């Protein structure tokens, strides 16, 4: 929570941090993406493979995507702590992200961070003690419709009524990996009273296309 | 055409909005993407151009420019640097999913614009800055682009045309603000996502100092659809100077919360109670409605009776159009605290960088979480109005504007909630 | 900038001293603090002439207009891109 950097035992500028060699033809396809002397653009691609490889962000991550790069290390430190999704301490094994601003919030987002609260035994922030899961609340996640829902590292998890985030809970103690969609019956993001469109076969190639094209 | 709305499949652009189809190649060709690709790149600009001046259409990611002539702002010879066509497909706005459901569902769409735009105003490259938290459908859009270099539709000479033009997808790693066109620039850049002064305008100044456009996932992927149909096709739908169809995500306190493609002036009831199954609890039940995402100003249930969802019809609504993203909220809602949640969202979802946002937001934040309890007294309402209207036209980019709104549109139309709350408090807190 | 309109006359300063007593700053300098305002060169020149005084003139400092330029903070090729904003 703070923007600060103090050198604790695990987390200082002799941490070791490297990335894998297949990391490394990773970060040279990224870099290849930008125009030639602007290799400073792949700052927050790296970073976020850093992210990827290792967890979390310690303090040679950062500096290695400043020597990598050939950037000052203050200007990844920027980016690192400027987005939020940069995770400067080590979190959980499965990070759960509830969503609680207001398209959520109507739909009763509270009774999830609740039920994954009882279900942990931890609050908003807090890590359980076998590093597992870090239950933090975030901001709007996009899956709108979808609300109230959660994302657990990659995932969205949506539709979501308490006994359903109870029973993902359930299956990522038990090892296994649940499905990223809607708990209730419906889909992606329809009416969940059967189709209000989109019913009919659509055209295909050549419909409605004017004259001379 | 005097009555809006009641849209046909047979119009509808985005097609397999629901997953309901196979998302890629040989399913998007199937539909009627990637057809005649070539015949509208060897057209020219300034025929593209045309088309989407013709249609009249206007931006879809909040501001609602008109389209063409934002995009013929890069209608001009080369000065040696390379141009660019950049997507906007960050999406933080509350409310609003529809740009995922295009990304996820449609996503040769998005490349064919993505094609058809950059061809229009002569862009080397197409540099889509997706959402870090959509991973899936960034994976999703990655599998469409490699189908399409694969196939040779982009790329070295791109659909068989003589053009060449690669497509990058470039994800964010979590702002809202970098879903402003300059911050957006300024994080694919890799810096922090603080937004540009203007001028210089991103069509002179833009991704790397070159010439850059920034448009909308729906916006560019419409273009192709404005390209085959005709653009008298598309401006055959809505009002005048509010052409064509558009995503309308319905959210909140409805029955069937969903996304959907309807006509651009359809009415906000209509649309509520035909593809949402209607209010919880009935239209009566009906509080407030967020017409189009976080940023516009609330409008109460006799307003949202007879409007009608289009730009002008909300502006004169005294709110604003936005990204089309309809909050709806019932009579069983702390709307203050509802509010008082969107200016928290607006906080911490703000990039810091000039003085009225960075300090005056965080200031609404705390006179609006007084608000919520009642621990506030009634000339701090007209403060709040005050420190708004401080905040508005003051900042470097929109999102103060965009944070001063609800707090405007909630003051004008519930200001006898916030008195008596802050009335009740005092007469239990003393 | 309020405070480099007018010109100025001092004098050379002279010797300060502590006071036994107090510690304090004496001085045996009638015209340490006299500070006179002109409102030009010329004036502060008839002045000193006028008075005996010999004097210095030291010409007024302009600072040299310079090109300022926000989208010089962003070039393609130039070195004058900022790392940060
Ligand atoms: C705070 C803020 C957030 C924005 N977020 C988005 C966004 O997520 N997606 C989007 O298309 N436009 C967003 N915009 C609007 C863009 O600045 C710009 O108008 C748009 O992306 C491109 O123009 P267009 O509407 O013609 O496509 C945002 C604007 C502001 C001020
Ligand atoms: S308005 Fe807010 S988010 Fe935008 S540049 Fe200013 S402080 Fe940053
Ligand atoms: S409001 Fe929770 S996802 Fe947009």
Redesign the interface.
């Known amino acids: 929570a703070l923007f600060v950097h103090r050198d604790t035992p695990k987390n200082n500028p002799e941490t070791p941090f490297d990335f894998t060699p297949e990391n490394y033809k990773r970060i040279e396809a990224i870099v290849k ?3 030639e ?2 290799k ?6 790296v ?2 493979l850093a992210q990827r490889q290792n967890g979390w962000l310690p303090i040679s991550a950062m500096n290695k995507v400043a020597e990598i790069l050939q ?2 290390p ?2 990844v430190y ?2 690192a702590t ?5 995770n400067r301490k080590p979190v959980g094994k499965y990070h759960i992200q509830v969503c ?4 959520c ?3 009763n987002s509270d009774s999830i961070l609740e039920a994954i609260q009882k279900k942990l035994g931890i609050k908003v922030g807090e890590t359980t003690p076998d590093k597992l899961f870090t239950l933090i609340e975030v ?9 109230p829902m959660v ?1 657990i590292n ?3 998890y949506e539709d979501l009524t308490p006994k359903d985030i109870e029973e993902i809970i359930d299956e990522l103690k038990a090892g296994k990996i649940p499905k ?1 969609g809607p708990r209730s019956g419906r ?7 059967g ?6 076969p ?9 004259a001379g ?1 | 055409k005097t009555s809006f709305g009641s ?4 119009d ?1 652009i985005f ?7 196979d998302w890629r190649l040989k399913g998007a ?4 993407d990637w ?2 690709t070539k ?2 790149l060897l ?1 020219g600009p300034d025929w593209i151009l045309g088309e989407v001046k013709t249609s009249g259409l206007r931006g879809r990611g909040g501001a609602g420019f008109p389209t063409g002539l934002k995009w013929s702002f890069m209608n001009k010879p080369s000065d040696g640097r ?1 141009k660019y066509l950049v997507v906007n497909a960050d ?7 529809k740009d ?2 295009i990304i ?2 449609d996503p040769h769409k998005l490349v064919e614009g993505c094609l058809v735009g950059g061809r229009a105003m002569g862009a080397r490259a197409a540099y889509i800055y997706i ?6 459908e960034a994976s999703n859009l990655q599998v469409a682009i490699r189908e399409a270099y694969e196939a040779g539709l982009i790329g070295k000479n791109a659909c068989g045309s003589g053009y060449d033009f690669d497509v ?1 997808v ?7 603000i970098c879903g402003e066109e300059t911050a957006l620039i300024e ?7 603080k937004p540009r002064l203007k001028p210089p305008f991103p069509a002179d100044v833009g991704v ?1 100092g070159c010439p850059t456009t920034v448009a909308n996932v729906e916006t560019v992927a419409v273009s192709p659809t404005i ?4 653009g008298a ?1 598309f401006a055959s739908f809505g009002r005048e100077r509010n052409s064509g169809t558009k995503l309308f ?5 409805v ?7 309807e006509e651009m002036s359809v009415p906000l009831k209509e649309l509520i109670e ?4 209607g209010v919880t609890g009935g239209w009566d039940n009906l509080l407030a409605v ?1 017409p189009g995402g ?1 940023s516009t100003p609330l409008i109460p249930k006799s307003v949202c009776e007879t409007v009608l969802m289009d730009f002008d019809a909300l502006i004169q609504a005294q709110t604003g159009l936005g990204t089309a ?1 309809v ?1 709806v ?1 019932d009579r069983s ?1 702390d709307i203050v605290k ?2 008082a ?2 200016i928290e ?1 607006y906080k ?2 703000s ?1 810091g960088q000039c003085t009225p946002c960075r300090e005056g937001v965080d200031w609404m934040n705390k006179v609006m979480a007084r608000f919520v309890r009642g621990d506030a007294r009634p000339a701090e309402i007209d403060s709040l109005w005050e420190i708004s209207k401080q905040i508005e036209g003051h900042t470097i980019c929109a999102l103060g504007d965009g944070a001063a709104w609800p707090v405007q549109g909630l003051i004008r139309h519930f200001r006898p909630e916030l008195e008596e709350r802050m009335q009740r408090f005092a007469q239990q807190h003393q | 900038v309020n405070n480099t309109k007018k010109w100025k006359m001092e004098f050379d300063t002279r010797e300060r001293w502590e006071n036994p007593l107090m510690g304090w700053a004496s001085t045996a300098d009638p015209l340490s603090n006299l500070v006179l305002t002109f409102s030009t060169k010329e004036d502060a020149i008839a002045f000193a002439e006028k008075n005996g005084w010999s004097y210095d003139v030291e010409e007024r400092k302009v600072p040299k207009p310079k090109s300022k330029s926000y989208g010089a903070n962003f070039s393609w ?1 130039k070195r004058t891109r900022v ?2 904003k």
Not at chain 1, 82 to 86: D, Q
Not at chain 2, 274 to 277: D, N, R, T
Request: proline share 7%.
């Open positions: 993406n930008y125009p002397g602007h400073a653009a792949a700052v927050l691609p970073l976020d950037v000052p203050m200007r920027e980016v400027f987005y939020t999704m940069y609680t601003t207001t398209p919030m109507l739909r901001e709007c996640l996009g899956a709108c419709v979808n609300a994302q990659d995932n969205y990223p889909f992606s993001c329809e009416p969940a009273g189709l209000t469109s989109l019913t009919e659509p055209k295909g190639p050549g419909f409605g296309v004017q094209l | 849209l046909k499949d047979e509808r097609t397999n909005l629901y997953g309901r189809h060709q199937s539909r009627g057809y005649k015949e509208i057209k390379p999406e933080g706005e509350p409310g609003t999913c995922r459901e996820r569902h959402r870090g938290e959509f991973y899936n990058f470039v994800r964010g790693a979590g702002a809202y994080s694919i850049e890799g810096k922090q996502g790397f390209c085959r149909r005709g096709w995500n319905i959210s909140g306190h029955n069937n919360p969903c996304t959907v493609e035909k593809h949402a199954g967020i976080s993203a909050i909220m809602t509802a509010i949640r969107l969202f911490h979802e990039c | 090729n790392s940060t």
